[PDB]
Amino acid sequence: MEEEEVETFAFQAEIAQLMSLIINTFYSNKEIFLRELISNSSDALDKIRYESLTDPSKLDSGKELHINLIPNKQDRTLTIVDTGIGMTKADLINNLGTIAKSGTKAFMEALQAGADISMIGQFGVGFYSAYLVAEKVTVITKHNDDEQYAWESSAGGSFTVRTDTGEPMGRGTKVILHLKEDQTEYLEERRIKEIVKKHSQFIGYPITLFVEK
Ligand SMILES: Cc1cc(C)c2cc1C(=O)NCCCNC(=O)CCSc1cc-2nc(N)n1
């Protein structure tokens, strides 16, 4: 019998409250979740690109800088993969739930005052827009300085971190969105193309879309 170690964490209370606002409030422009995730991937790709200017050995783990979009109707998942800088275990725990960075409180309060969801990325909490369309999010990441980890949350105030048992990545991050039953439009080629063309036209890395037969 295989034994796997899991670490469970509570979201920092303001992040939990922001997540509750995103999950329990209707917002009309939900499609921006994809812009936010592609933006995070592009930022991660910039970090490894700029670091590689003085240290080419940082690309030993992979020299291609790109993004893949993978919908899967059977699993009801939309996956965004990049070959960006990735996150170490510390980065993952620090940035994906235990610390409310400046932006979290300001945006949470802006949403409580009736603001739209559109500017979420400006407040540095764009990742959490995944919860407009997903009931569960899994983040797989690999940084040069560490092992491959899997973060996962179905909201409800908690998340888990474990060393990943899935397919290997040389370096980068994979965000797997387990879509809500009424948000399956985001598995459609036409809808994904619409959103990429509307919101991510100027992304400086190539995006490959895998279209299901
Ligand atoms: C909340 C959050 C969630 C994810 C999944 C990423 C970044 C952040 C974030 O706001 N980090 C704030 C810190 C700045 N971002 C980084 O340093 C990138 C680490 S790699 C990376 C990180 C993320 N997503 C991808 N695709 N690659």
The two tokens of residue 45 are 């790709």
Candidate of 35, 87, 102, 144 to mutate for ligand 1, largest count of ligand atoms within 8 Å of Cβ: 87
- Check if 79 has its Cβ closer than 6 Å to any atom of ligand 1: no
Provide the 8-state DSSP code for 96.
I
Q: In this structure, are residues 112 and 180 in contact, taking their beta carbons and an 8 Å threshold?
A: no
Q: How far is the CA of 104 from the centre of ligand 1 (A)?
A: 14
Q: In this structure, are residues 212 and 72 in contact, taking their beta carbons and an 8 Å threshold?
A: yes
Q: Binding residue per annotation — 127?
A: yes
CB atoms within 10 A of CB 90: 11
Residue 19 identity: M
Kindly report the CATH class assigned to 1-213. Answer: alpha beta
Provide the 8-state DSSP code for 52.
H
Q: In this structure, are residues 127 and 183 in contact, taking their beta carbons and an 8 Å threshold?
A: no
The two tokens of residue 152 are 């996962």
Nearest-angstrom CA–CA distance, 190 and 212: 12
Q: Binding residue per annotation — 82?
A: yes
- Check if 88 has its Cβ closer than 6 Å to any atom of ligand 1: no
Q: What is the resolution of this structure in A?
A: 1.5
- Check if 85 has its Cβ closer than 6 Å to any atom of ligand 1: yes
Give the three-class secondary structure for 207.
strand
For ligand 1, atom 16, name the residue with the nearest CA.
44
- Check if 45 has its Cβ closer than 6 Å to any atom of ligand 1: no
Residues with Cβ within 8 Å of residue 62, at least 6 apart in sequence = 83, 170, 171, 172
